[PDB]
Structure formats: structure tokens, C-alpha cells
Write a protein that binds this ligand. Structure first.
Ligand SMILES: [Zn+2]
Ligand SMILES: [Zn+2]
Ligand SMILES: [Zn+2]
Length: 572
């Protein structure tokens, strides 16, 4: 029971027993915590509890030291000292922000604001606390027992009475019973098992509650600026393709860590892989939270880097299908592509952490704990989507609060900014440039004259909470008959239920705005579905319309975002 105080590092035997992460708090900070919060249980080798037989006094403010033991006011000997007095709690070696992190339920946006504006040790305490609170919350839901199986992809479920039913989307991942992880989509439901197994009737599914490990490494290592490129050896023969990023690559070797804000289609993966060609002998670990982000880096590496020096790290508990072209699980290869949770304990000359808007402070800390590098490059865009905060229900989380990296990019600016969008028609570039980039994003492409908008509120029905707009899908159906080139469009909306309906009525491939992030398609058809904070979110709107290379049709519910679209308006 010997450790360091999370607020002032002073050594102690005192841990707060009421905090779910039981942080070590010194004599001074333990007092400031117990006297200002409902937290009154203090722990050491032995807890601070009344030693008198059958006594239930556990409140440190109602306890005293009687020689070497602890007793309440009713049981203490005449010669006894209060454990709580004079701004200290008794212990060996003898905060407003800590109290709020320690006691919040993580349902308000203000809780996440604090977890990102506090000191570095409090950011780790906040990240550990939040993740443990998120995992304990998973236990609240009800079990689903297979009543009947229809085909190889569809079944019917029987839910536990009394306990709430979690939202059925590709976001919530169940664990089958250990018949592999399973996922659900909208009385006939669609079942998706990782391991192809003949769905046994009577078997049950439960959400994967994993143990939250403690955080040691900071979210960001301390910044170091150098006079020369350090520990990296540049090429003088650098491919003309990557010449645009030479000054940025030099900035990377002249700092401990660097931030790159890359709006959609501005060249983030090109930048990440070109960094390997610019420092040809440097061992680079490419990491991101999702398998899709890691795979998109693998695809770019396949095109420019020697395949024999690449390796895709895959966890033995193979969840989803990923990149199969590199040698699997070779930690020692020069180029290692791996998701944040599967990272081995290794070193590198450069660590590239991509899709930084999707990282949490927990992820930022894990990377710093498993990878010791000469340089760290954080690539992403705070104008794109963050990681879903399952507990957050009240208030909106602004980009400067996504994580420490996004906070830096939004306050002091990013170290490097990719200012030219090469993917999108100018109509889209001009719209998002004004909306989220302060007019700094420029279009490479001309206006395509294939970007349309329609203001159509339709009718909003709901599949539990997930929304559907059948009249908006009807407008799309009518448009498709008159615009056959759009037969190849990807249908996008903010809701899985809208997408399930569009899939059956239109037959187009479907994507939620959130799962479309990082991907691009020639034609995109977007139905806003509703006017909610979710469907009107500017970052979500930004991602939605920037998926299109050639054309986009936006069927809008919100007048504000409709008016902001620099698209040709359609009638009906
Ligand atoms: Zn302290
Ligand atoms: Zn506490
Ligand atoms: Zn007592």
C-alpha cells in the first residue's frame, strides 16, 4: 500500500476507498477530498474504520487514532487524536478539479471538458475513472437468449425482463456463449458473427465488459524542440510526389511530437507514408484506434514501401477481417501497422498515430506506455468525428475536448495543416471550408455541377430511438430513376435504421456518417433523416459531404445546414 499522490506526488499509505480507481492521496489532498465530497472512506494496510467490535463507523471525519488503532467518537480512548484535523488526514510522510472527476457520473459534457482542461496526472485519473465507469455501466443491460434462427444471417431474440435493452447497432459488440464476438442490426433482426457458427437456439449474448488497466504514461510526452533533425537521417533524393511535405517532414525530426491537421482528402495517408520515404532507415510504427484506419495506412504503404519490411499486427482474438498482404505479427519489421489495443511493448524512431479525432486520452496514454519513440506524429482532424462517449447524454462535446492532441490543435493550432483538398468537387470544399475550417481549405478540383441539395422534412418515424425518414428515401428513389449514373452511389445517413430501410428500398450500399469516415466514393446520397443535435452536428455534416469524389445529393431536414450547402437546389 505504498504509492504516490495523484494531485501532488507526495508519498503516502492513504488511498480514497470511495473512488472507483482508489487513487493514492497524501495527508493534505486526502483531507481536501474527504471534507468537500461524499467520499469519507480512507484505506491503508488496514482501512480507516472503527476497530471497536461490531462498530460500523467508516467516515474518516468521525474517526480518531487511539494509540495505533482507529475508533469513532463513541469508542475512542481518552488519549486520542482526530484522523481529520488541521487540513490533513493522519498517515505516513505527513483539488476542486480532482473532486469533480472523482464524483461525476460522466453523463454531462462538462465532465469531459474538465477531464481535458485539468493537469496531466488528473487527465490520466479522469481517463481511468471514465473507462471503469463505462465498463461497470455495461453490466446494467439485459441478456438476449436466441428464441429462433431463420437463415444464415437473420434470427429472433428474447430479452431479459427488468434490465434495459442496449441499442442494436454496429457500435455495441456482444460476446456469444465463448462462440466469438457477435454484432446486431435492425420482429426479424440481422445477426453478425465473427466466427461462422451455426446459431444454437438457447445460447446467450452479453456485452463485452473488459478490465480497465491503470494509466502510467502521460497523454502527450513533454515537448522538446531541437536545433537539428534528431535521430533521423533524411534522403537528399526525395521523390517529387512527396516534395510538398519535405518542410513538414523536417519539422517532424526537429520536435519530440508534432500535430498534423489534415481536412478530408488533403493527403494525410500520403504524408504518413512519405515520412518513411523521407527518413528511409527509420523504424516506424503506424497506429490508430480502428482496424479500418490501420488498414487504410497499410493500403498506402503497399503502394510505396517495400512489402518485406512491413507487418500487420493482429490480435490472436481476431475480431474483424483486416489487411492480409503483409507478414502477420512480426513486431521486428521496419514498418509495423497495428491498432492501439494490440500494440506490443516496443521502441521506434517515429510513431505515427492516425485518425487522432477518434482517440481518447486513455488511447493517448496507452500509446505512450507501449511505444518509446524518438518522434511522435499525431495525424487527424478536430473538424471530423470523435470516439463515441457511451455515457455522455447531456450537452455537446466540442472538438477542443476530444483529447489532448485535439485540444492543442484547437487552442495553439496544429504544427502542420494540409490546406488543399484533392478529393472533393469545389462545391463541397467551399461549403466545409467556410463551415469548419475558417475559409482555409482550398479546392483542387473544379465545381463538378453534380452536387445537389433538396430541402425535404418528410416524416420521422423511430425504431426505438434510431430514426427513419421513408419520404426522404422516396425522394431519392424518384431522383435515381431520372439520374441513372447515380445507380452506383453510396447511401449515407446519420442513422443505422434509416440505412436499413434505404438498403431494402434503393438497393444502394449503405454507410452511417460515422462508419464512412476515412472512406471515399464517386457518388454519395445523403438523407439528413431528422433535425436532432446528432444529425445537425457540424463535424458529422463535414464528414458526410466530404466522402464524395464526383457528386453528392443531400436531402436536408435542417434549414441552416441546407442554406450553407453551396449546391444546386432541386425541386419536388
Ligand atoms: Zn497530494
Ligand atoms: Zn474519493
Ligand atoms: Zn466505533
Amino acid at each position: 500500500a505504498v504509492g504516490a499522490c495523484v494531485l501532488c506526488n507526495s508519498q503516502t499509505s492513504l488511498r480514497c476507498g470511495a473512488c472507483i480507481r482508489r487513487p493514492f492521496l497524501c495527508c493534505k489532498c486526502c483531507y481536501d477530498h474527504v471534507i468537500s465530497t461524499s467520499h469519507k472512506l480512507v484505506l491503508s494496510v488496514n482501512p480507516y474504520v472503527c476497530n471497536a467490535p461490531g462498530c460500523d463507523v467508516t467516515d474518516v471525519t468521525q474517526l480518531y487514532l487511539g494509540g495505533m488503532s482507529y475508533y469513532c467518537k463513541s469508542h475512542k480512548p481518552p488519549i486520542s487524536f482526530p484522523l481529520c484535523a488541521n487540513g490533513q488526514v493522519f498517515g505516513l510522510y505527513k483539488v476542486t478539479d480532482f473532486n469533480a472527476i472523482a464524483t461525476c457520473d460522466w453523463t454531462n459534457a462538462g465532465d469531459y471538458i474538465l477531464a481535458n482542461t485539468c493537469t496531466e496526472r488528473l487527465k490520466l485519473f479522469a481517463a481511468e475513472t471514465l473507462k471503469a465507469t463505462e465498463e461497470t455501466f455495461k453490466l446494467s443491460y439485459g441478456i438476449a437468449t436466441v428464441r429462433e434462427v431463420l437463415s444464415d444471417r437473420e434470427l429472433h431474440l428474447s430479452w431479459e425482463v427488468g434490465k434495459p435493452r442496449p441499442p442494436l447497432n454496429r457500435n455495441y459488440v456482444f460476446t456469444g456463449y465463448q462462440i466469438g464476438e457477435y454484432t446486431f442490426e435492425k420482429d426479424a433482426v440481422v445477426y453478425r458473427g465473427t466466427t461462422t457458427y451455426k446459431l444454437n437456439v438457447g445460447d446467450y449474448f452479453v456485452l463485452t465488459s473488459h478490465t480497465v488497466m491503470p494509466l502510467s504514461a502521460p497523454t502527450l510526452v513533454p515537448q522538446e524542440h531541437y536545433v537539428r533533425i534528431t535521430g533521423l537521417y533524411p534522403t537528399l533524393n526525395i521523390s517529387d510526389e512527396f516534395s510538398s511535405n519535405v518542410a513538414n517532414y523536417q519539422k517532424v525530426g526537429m520536435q519530440k511530437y508534432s500535430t498534423l491537421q489534415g481536412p478530408p482528402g488533403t493527403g494525410k495517408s500520403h504524408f504518413a507514408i512519405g515520412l518513411a520515404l523521407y527518413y528511409p532507415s527509420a523504424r516506424i510504427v503506424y497506429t490508430a484506434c480502428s482496424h479500418a484506419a490501420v488498414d487504410a495506412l497499410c493500403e498506402k504503404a503497399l503502394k510505396y514501401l517495400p512489402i518485406d519490411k512491413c507487418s500487420r499486427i493482429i490480435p490472436a482474438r481476431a475480431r474483424v477481417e483486416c489487411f492480409d498482404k503483409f507478414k502477420v505479427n512480426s513486431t521486428l519489421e521496419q514498418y509495423v501497422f497495428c491498432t492501439v489495443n494490440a500494440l506490443p511493448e516496443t521502441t521506434a524512431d517515429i510513431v505515427v498515430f492516425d485518425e487522432i479525432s477518434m482517440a481518447t486520452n486513455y488511447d493517448l496514454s496507452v500509446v505512450n506506455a507501449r511505444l518509446r519513440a524518438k518522434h511522435y506524429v499525431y495525424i487527424g482532424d478536430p473538424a471530423q468525428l470523435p470516439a463515441p462517449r457511451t455515457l455522455l447524454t447531456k450537452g455537446t462535446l466540442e472538438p477542443e475536448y476530444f483529447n489532448s492532441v485535439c485540444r492543442l490543435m484547437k487552442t495553439i493550432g496544429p504544427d502542420m495543416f494540409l490546406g488543399t483538398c484533392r478529393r472533393c468537387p469545389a462545391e463541397i470544399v467551399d461549403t466545409v471550408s467556410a463551415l469548419v475550417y475558417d475559409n482555409k481549405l482550398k479546392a483542387h478540383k473544379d465545381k463538378s455541377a453534380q452536387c445537389f441539395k433538396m430541402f425535404y422534412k418528410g416524416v420521422i418515424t423511430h425504431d426505438v430511438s434510431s430514426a427513419i425518414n421513408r419520404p426522404q428515401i422516396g425522394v431519392v428513389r424518384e431522383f435515381l430513376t431520372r439520374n441513372p449514373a447515380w445507380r452506383k452511389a453510396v447511401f449515407i445517413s446519420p442513422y443505422n435504421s434509416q440505412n436499413a430501410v434505404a438498403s431494402k428500398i434503393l438497393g444502394l450500399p449503405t454507410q452511417t456518417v460515422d462508419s464512412s469516415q476515412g472512406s471515399e466514393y464517386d457518388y454519395v446520397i445523403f438523407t439528413q433523416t431528422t433535425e436532432t443535435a446528432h444529425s445537425c452536428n457540424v463535424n458529422r455534416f463535414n464528414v458526410a459531404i466530404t466522402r464524395a469524389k464526383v457528386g453528392i445529393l443531400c436531402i436536408m431536414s435542417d434549414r441552416d445546414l441546407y442554406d450553407k450547402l453551396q449546391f444546386t437546389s432541386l425541386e419536388i
